[PDB]
Amino acid sequence: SKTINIRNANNFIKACLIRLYTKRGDSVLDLGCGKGGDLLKYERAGIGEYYGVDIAEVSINDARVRARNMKRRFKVFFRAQDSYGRHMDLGKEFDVISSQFSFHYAFSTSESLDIAQRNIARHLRPGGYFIMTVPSRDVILERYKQGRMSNDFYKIELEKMEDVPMESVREYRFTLLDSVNNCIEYFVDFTRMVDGFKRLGLSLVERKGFIDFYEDEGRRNPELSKKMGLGCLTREESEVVGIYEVVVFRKL
Ligand SMILES: C[S@@+](CC[C@H](N)C(=O)[O-])C[C@H]1O[C@@H](n2cnc3c(N)ncnc32)[C@H](O)[C@@H]1O
């Protein structure tokens, strides 16, 4: 309830990102789909097929039930397995692969990233898109130097301290009110990701902050913002949102 505005913003930004790169009849691969909280959005986008994969079976179960009890016009496929740290082959390619708030979990180890990036590339049609919303390392480290790493909504803690380079930390503890609790998150090594994808044929095409994206997309057209309880984010709510950023790659 206290995080309603934050959830509306994230869902909005997600709907805008989805509406920006998807077209009628497209096939989508939702990595880390979770409880399938995007099935509604894709249903509006008019996509023809949706495939959701998540490591947590408890979340896939919710998504199955939701897809089962929703007025959808597209075929749905669900599978509970590790799509990042384990070889995956669904046997087909998709026009768009989305990963909202979960791809950073692919940065467990160099091997986990290489495996994950390879799974995305073999399931992406030539000219296909790979959309994602992941935490921003630069943003996080900047707030570390500022001394403010939390408020009434979130809380972040880094790794070591005793003679340990600030740029050396590769993971942290994230906590969100009425959500994750002291969850282990892995930093996103942008450079390694870019170079890694560039090697598989995927090039970077977009990278924008949640706030700027939020404001821009919210002005480009009119209130779709009317639908959801959107409006004016407070400074405190903006700190939680201003944590993530949008990143898009295209298979050239
Ligand atoms: C914040 S939740 C996603 C919620 C949903 N995507 C959305 O945008 O509302 C992150 C998800 O990442 C998934 N995840 C974490 N590690 C994963 C892995 N190795 N393979 C697949 N999914 C993974 C979890 O099971 C969790 O449901």
From Swiss-Prot:
Belongs to the class I-like SAM-binding methyltransferase superfamily. mRNA cap 0 methyltransferase family. Changing D38 to A/N: Reduces activity by 99%. Changing D30 to A/N: Reduces activity by 95%. Changing Y105 to A/S/V: Reduces activity by 98%. Changing Y105F: Reduces activity by 66%. It holds the Pfam family mRNA_G-N7_MeTrfase. Gene3D superfamilies: Vaccinia Virus protein VP39. One of its GO terms (molecular function) is mRNA 5'-cap (guanine-N7-)-methyltransferase activity. Changing H104A: Reduces activity by 53%. Reduces activity by 99%. This is mRNA cap guanine-N(7) methyltransferase. Its EC number is 2.1.1.56. Changing D30E: Reduces activity by 60%. MRNA binds at N10, N11. Changing N11D: Reduces activity by 96%. Changing N10A: No effect. Loss of activity. Changing D38E: Reduces activity by 75%. It is found in: Nucleus. PROSITE patterns: RNA_CAP0_MT. The lineage of its organism: Eukaryota, Fungi, Fungi incertae sedis, Microsporidia, Unikaryonidae. One of its GO terms (cellular component) is nucleus. It comes from Encephalitozoon cuniculi (strain GB-M1). Signal peptide: none annotated.
